[PDB]
Amino acid sequence: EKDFLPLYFGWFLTKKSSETLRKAGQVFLEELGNHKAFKKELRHFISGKEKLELVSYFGKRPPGVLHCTTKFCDYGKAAGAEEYAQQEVVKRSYGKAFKLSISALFVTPKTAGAQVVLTDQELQLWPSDLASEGLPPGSRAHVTLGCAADVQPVQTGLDLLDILQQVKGGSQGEAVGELPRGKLYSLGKGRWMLSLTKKMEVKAIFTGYYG
Ligand SMILES: Nc1ncnc2c1ncn2[C@@H]1O[C@H](CO)[C@@H](O)[C@H]1OP(=O)(O)O
């Protein structure tokens, strides 16, 4: 017969790095939800002067260890899944330890996440399958921290690219606040970005999740 692939490949953060990044994620949501600049724009965030707690809003969280997905394969069902998995670099990198650089945390009405900036060696593990929005490959790279109730997986990546495209255009604007980890930017349409002063490094293992 034939070997079937994972549900997806990706970098899976270590227990330690997962707990650090998860904790920073919640603090950001707590800080953002309580920031005056965010409350001003709540009507651009939800359709519903009360306060919204974003930890609650992003109720659908990764339950185990956080991860940075590369190729979603659906056991080979997804286009290009087999071609991605058959690559040498993928087979060679399987079970290898990597360090991922987090450059920012972001929030939209649909998802909450951390932006990952991949190295050139890590970029070799990015699927070529990934409308381009004139951004370099790997721009979508991220760790999901939370999702709104009716949101489906893929949306976090889309949300990030939209944001990075807005930043690209220079329409990110002056910062609207300073948080302990960096500057907060209001991109409108319920979109928010914390640019980390110091990029956060997390340890991960590249491997396949079967579920
Ligand atoms: N097209 C797709 N369908 C389902 N999951 C996808 C996907 N593309 C990427 N993924 C990722 O696969 C994992 C399981 O669904 C999720 O972490 C998701 O990343 P996400 O964090 O943006 O949701």
Numbering used by the authors: 161 to 208, 212 to 293, 298 to 378
The authors write:
Pro225 and Pro296 reside in loops α3-β2 and α6-β5, respectively, flanking the edges of the active site – Pro296 near the adenine moiety and Pro225 on the 5′-side of the ligand, next to Pro226. Interestingly, the mutant P296G has a marginally higher kcat than the wild-type enzyme. In P296G, which exhibits a higher kcat than wild-type CNPcat, while kcat/KM remains in similar range, the mutation-containing loop α6-β5 is disordered in the crystal structure, but adopts a different conformation compared to wild-type CNPcat. In the P296G structure, a 2′-AMP product is present in the active site. In contrast to the wild type enzyme, the adenine base is in a conformation similar to that seen in V321A before, and the β5-α7 loop has similarly adopted the open state. The latter, together with earlier liganded structures with an open β5-α7 loop34, suggests that loop opening is not an artifact caused by the V321A mutation, but rather a stabilized state so far not seen in crystal structures of the wild-type protein in complex with 2′-AMP. Additionally, the activity is probably not hindered by the observed base-flipping phenomenon, as demonstrated by P296G. Furthermore Arg307 has moved slightly away from the active site to the general direction where Gln307 would reside in the R307Q structure and Arg307 in the sulphate complex. This, again, suggests that active site loop dynamics are linked to the conformation of Arg307. On the other hand, some mutant variants, such as P296G, even appeared slightly more stable than the wild-type protein.
